[PDB]
Description:
The structure is cut from a larger assembly and holds two copies of chain A (about 50 residues).
Chain A: E1 24-28, E2 31-35
Antiparallel strand pairs in A: 1-2
The complex binds 2-acetamido-2-deoxy-beta-D-glucopyranose (NAG) (2 copies).
Amino acid sequence: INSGTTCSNDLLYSNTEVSTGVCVNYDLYGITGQGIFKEVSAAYYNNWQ
Amino acid sequence: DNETLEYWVTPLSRRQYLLNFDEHGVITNAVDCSSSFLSEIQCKTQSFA
Ligand SMILES: *[C@@H]1O[C@H](CO)[C@@H](O)[C@H](O)[C@H]1NC(C)=O
Ligand SMILES: *[C@@H]1O[C@H](CO)[C@@H](O)[C@H](O)[C@H]1NC(C)=O
């Protein structure tokens, strides 16, 4: 639950921008919470992570 | 040509390990928590040294 790609399309909103710097509620592909995003240059994500 | 075939097989079971993840995200060390007494100390302090 709350992670994956088998989503329920009952309640619908549109995809928004990842807005960095401000405290926001996020629903990122099932993950939910509150926080502040910061864009970074990462090299540790493989094709499955 | 002095070549050999090789296939090594050992059984699996459910058990607890301590895995070390390095700077890039690669598992570099592991310890089986119930194999010796040093591994008891290592899994207890959650340290490899
Ligand atoms: C604080 O407010 C300033 C200006 O109103 C804004 O630029 C900044 O992103 C805000 N920071 C946070 C953490 O809300
Ligand atoms: C294979 O091993 C034998 C062992 O005596 C050696 O004499 C021979 O030169 C080796 N041949 C090759 C192709 O490695």
